[PDB]
Amino acid sequence: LELLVERLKEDDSSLYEASLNALKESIKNSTSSMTAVPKPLKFLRPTYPDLCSIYDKWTDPNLKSSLADVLSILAMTYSENGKHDSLRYRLLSDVSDFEGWGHEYIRHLALEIGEVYNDQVEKDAEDETSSDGSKSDGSAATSGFEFSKEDTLRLCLDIVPYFLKHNGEEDAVDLLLEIESIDKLPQFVDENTFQRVCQYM
């Protein structure tokens, strides 16, 4: 047998890369059978300390990129919502893939990101931060901080048409309401039924 969770601990990049990638791949099917727990999420979970510790380095060749994604997906199975948790890991994604709209992932991150960011920016703006407003258009950098950075906002835009192509329009309309859309309500439709969504909203 072989458990990919062990490989994650060790460092040695080309091997490490094939493994790290595979855990992403397997984080929408299954891999790594031959341990008692049936599902990868449980199997992965004691690896969390190890993952975070590699994560902090950036002297890694391309494994830093991947390392954050395995952590994001793990934050998400746990149902652990960020403010600096899943949100930091999500923020340093760049080789990430959109996968499991038929399960938690799409819904899980975009709503977490949105609720968090507005609440943080509201609170900050009262309590003497270089932010002002709520934030309600895209490309918000949140005064350099890890509440939101500028491509993270764009990933949240990106999620809106995904749900419209699947026809989870009910979730799509709801994320535009929460995020406090202005630009994005005309911008997101260019396809499918314009009508049913504008009306509901």
What does this structure look like?
- The chain is mostly helical.
- It contains 11 helices and no strands.
- Helix 2 runs parallel beside helix 5 and helix 8 runs antiparallel to helix 9.
- The protein is globular and about 55 Å long.
- It is classed as hydrolase.
The ordered string of helix (H) and strand (E) elements is: HHHHHHHHHHH
Radius of gyration: 18 Å
Kindly state the percentage of residues in helix.
55-70%
Sheet having the most strands? none
Which class best fits the helix and strand makeup?
mainly alpha
| Number of helices in the DSSP assignment | 11
Q: Report how far the terminal alpha carbons are from each other.
A: 53 Å
Q: What are the salient characteristics of this protein?
A:
mainly alpha, 11 helices, 1 chains, 201 residues
Topology:
Blueprint: H1 4-7, H2 13-26, H3 40-44, H4 48-56, H5 63-78, H6 86-91, H7 105-126, H8 150-166, H9 169-179, H10 184-188, H11 194-200
Q: What's this entry about, in short?
A:
This protein has helices spanning 4-7, 13-26, 40-44, 48-56, 63-78, 86-91, 105-126, 150-166, 169-179, 184-188, 194-200. It has 201 residues and is mostly helical. The PDB classes it as hydrolase.
